[PDB]
């Protein structure tokens, strides 16, 4: 049974032989490298602002801001959480345009919006992080620090947008699947977080609780058809029918895709393992068992390699290791966790994406990526 029920989180590092002391030290060190003052992906501005910088693209993305908020609440750092959320509401929240009610996906460090289009994976992380913040610290008096209200309001928009305006929802109401973006009719496998939706089914506005339960089930079934049956690899973008959408080159196993294994691992830990999840993780790990990180490439989902190397091999390592939570007795589970332990956080101008995935894996594998209840 999952941690949602037992309230006990598996410390896979410990179960695989690592000492509690070294695990504690490693988790803290990872956090400090990313959020400490050492030019690191988190930047503090003034006394009430802060943001996570996509060091490589020189911009601030809702993906990173929502990740940062989730990391901060997991680490019990309300000061950091509030700085990020404040920046988000001040510079990213849109009050005008067809996407009013959503958050501009990319902004410049000075706050200027680079687009008025949102990224659904950001919104869903914002919502859960806000629910967790409300549960750990309580809703603040002054907005936008009234966390739970912000979360319910946002999820209301995600489901009902368009009913009273020219906007569109982030979930298709008929198939209950999250969309790549509001105005298209296809998805992105890595955006599916059934474990998040299970919680939304308990904390969102009551009128949408049944919907969220259906979304969780829909996403679990979708992942089954989106992942290649032999390799377990999922495409970055996929049509609702499950097949890859390669219209613009996103139909292969690349950057976005890496998160699928991590998501499957966390869902298994929180809500329980499953035969499909264990088998899926075994497939992915088996595929990479005879491949060296330095040689990781972009692959068609059937395994065929491209000449192009993975742009985020450290992130791939981290996600494959996090996936072990869904197959603790898998033939390659231990090897993946060991590989991750022996892989330092990424350095350089493009440390951002890899390191976000890295910290999430460090938290999950150590039993510190928890559900915070009311």
Tell me the catalytic residues: 63, 256
Q: Using the rule CB under 5 A, give the single segment among 20-28, 83-91, 243-251, 361-369 that binds Ni ion.
A: 20-28
Please report how close the Cβ of residue 354 comes to Ni ion at its closest, in angstroms. Answer: 23
Burial class, 344, CB count within 10 angstroms (exposed 0-12 / middle 13-18 / buried 19+): exposed
Joined together, the tokens standing for residue 263 give: 């998501």
Please report how close the Cβ of residue 32 comes to Ni ion at its closest, in angstroms. Answer: 14
Distance between CA atoms of 142 and 135, rounded to whole angstroms? 17
Joined together, the tokens standing for residue 174 give: 């008929």
Q: Tell me if 245 sits within 8 A of 239, measured CB to CB.
A: yes
Q: Tell me whether residue 27 or residue 41 sits nearer to Ni ion (CB atom).
A: 27
**Pick from 250, 325, 255: nearest CA to 285:** 325
Please report how close the Cβ of residue 301 comes to Ni ion at its closest, in angstroms. Answer: 40
> In the block, which residue shows the tokens 């259906």?
214
Q: Using the rule CB under 5 A, give the single segment among 18-26, 53-61, 154-162, 339-347 that binds Ni ion.
A: 18-26
3-class state of residue 43 by DSSP: strand
Instruction: For 225-359, list the strands marked E by DSSP.
Output: 238-239, 297-299, 305-309
Q: Tell me whether residue 25 or residue 185 sits nearer to Ni ion (CB atom).
A: 25
Check binding of 25 to Ni ion (CB under 5 A). yes
3-class state of residue 324 by DSSP: helix
Q: Tell me whether residue 26 or residue 78 sits nearer to Ni ion (CB atom).
A: 26
Q: Using the rule CB under 5 A, give the single segment among 5-13, 24-32, 126-134, 357-365 that binds Ni ion.
A: 24-32
Total of chain residues touching Ni ion, rule CB under 5 A: 1
- How would DSSP label each residue in 190-218? GG--HHHHHHHHHHS-GGGHHHHHHHHHH
Q: Using the rule CB under 5 A, give the single segment among 25-33, 134-142, 223-231, 309-317 that binds Ni ion.
A: 25-33
Distance between CA atoms of 81 and 76, rounded to whole angstroms? 9
Q: Tell me whether residue 22 or residue 48 sits nearer to Ni ion (CB atom).
A: 22
Q: Is the peptide bond before 144 cis (omega within 30 degrees of 0)?
A: yes
Please report how close the Cβ of residue 338 comes to Ni ion at its closest, in angstroms. Answer: 17
Please report how close the Cβ of residue 256 comes to Ni ion at its closest, in angstroms. Answer: 35
Q: Tell me whether residue 23 or residue 359 sits nearer to Ni ion (CB atom).
A: 23
Q: Using the rule CB under 5 A, give the single segment among 23-31, 78-86, 87-95, 232-240 that binds Ni ion.
A: 23-31
Tell me the residue nearest to Ni ion as measured from the CB.
25
Check binding of 32 to Ni ion (CB under 5 A). no
**Pick from 5, 64, 91, 87: nearest CA to 355:** 64
Q: Tell me whether residue 20 or residue 25 sits nearer to Ni ion (CB atom).
A: 25
> In the block, which residue shows the tokens 């949602």?
4
Q: Tell me if 50 sits within 8 A of 87, measured CB to CB.
A: yes
Q: Tell me whether residue 8 or residue 25 sits nearer to Ni ion (CB atom).
A: 25
Check binding of 29 to Ni ion (CB under 5 A). no
Joined together, the tokens standing for residue 28 give: 């803290």
Residue 107: strand pairing partners = 60, 113
Please report how close the Cβ of residue 23 comes to Ni ion at its closest, in angstroms. Answer: 10
Distance between CA atoms of 219 and 179, rounded to whole angstroms? 11
Distance between CA atoms of 127 and 151, rounded to whole angstroms? 5
Please report how close the Cβ of residue 135 comes to Ni ion at its closest, in angstroms. Answer: 32
Kindly list the residues in this chain that would bind Ni ion in the complex (CB under 5 A). Answer: 25
């Amino acid at each position: 049974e999952g941690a949602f029920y037992t309230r006990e989180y598996r410390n896979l590092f410990k179960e695989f032989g690592y000492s509690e002391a070294e695990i504690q030290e490693r988790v803290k060190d990872t956090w400090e490298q990313l959020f400490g003052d050492n030019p690191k992906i988190y930047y503090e501005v003034g006394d009430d602002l802060g943001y996570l910088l996509d060091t490589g693209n020189l911009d601030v993305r809702t993906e990173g801001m929502s990740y940062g908020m989730m990391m901060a609440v997991q680490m019990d750092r309300k000061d950091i959480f509030d700085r990020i959320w404040n920046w988000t509401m001040k510079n990213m929240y849109m009050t005008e345009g067809v996407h009013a009610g959503y958050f501009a996906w990319s902004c410049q460090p000075d706050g200027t919006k680079n687009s008025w289009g949102p990224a659904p994976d950001g919104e869903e992380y914002f919502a859960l992080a806000l629910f967790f913040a409300s549960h750990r610290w309580g809703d603040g008096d002054e907005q936008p620090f009234n966390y739970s209200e912000q979360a319910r309001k946002l999820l209301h928009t995600c489901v009902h947008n368009g009913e009273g305006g020219p906007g569109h929802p982030m979930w298709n109401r008929d198939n209950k699947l999250i969309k790549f973006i509001p105005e298209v009719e296809f998805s992105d496998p890595s955006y599916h977080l059934p474990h998040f939706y299970e919680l939304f089914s308990l904390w969102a506005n009551e009128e949408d609780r049944v919907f969220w339960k259906e979304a969780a089930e829909a996403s679990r079934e979708y992942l089954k058809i989106a992942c290649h049956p032999e390799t377990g690899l999922a495409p970055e973008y996929a049509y609702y029918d499950g097949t890859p959408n390669d219209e613009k080159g996103y139909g292969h196993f690349f950057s976005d895709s890496y998160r699928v294994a991590a998501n499957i691992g966390l869902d298994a830990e929180w809500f329980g393992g499953s035969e499909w999840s264990a088998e899926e993780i075994n497939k992915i790990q088996a595929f990479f068992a005879d491949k060296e990180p330095e040689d990781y490439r972009r692959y068609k989902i059937d395994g065929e390699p491209f000449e192009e190397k993975s742009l985020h091999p450290v992130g791939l390592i981290a996600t494959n290791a996090m996936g072990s939570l869904a197959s603790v007795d898998g033939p390659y589970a231990k090897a993946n966790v060991d590989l991750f332990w022996n892989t330092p956080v990424r350095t350089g101008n493009r440390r951002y994406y890899d390191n976000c995935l890295y910290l999430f894996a460090m938290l999950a594998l150590s039993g510190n990526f928890k559900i915070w209840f009311p």
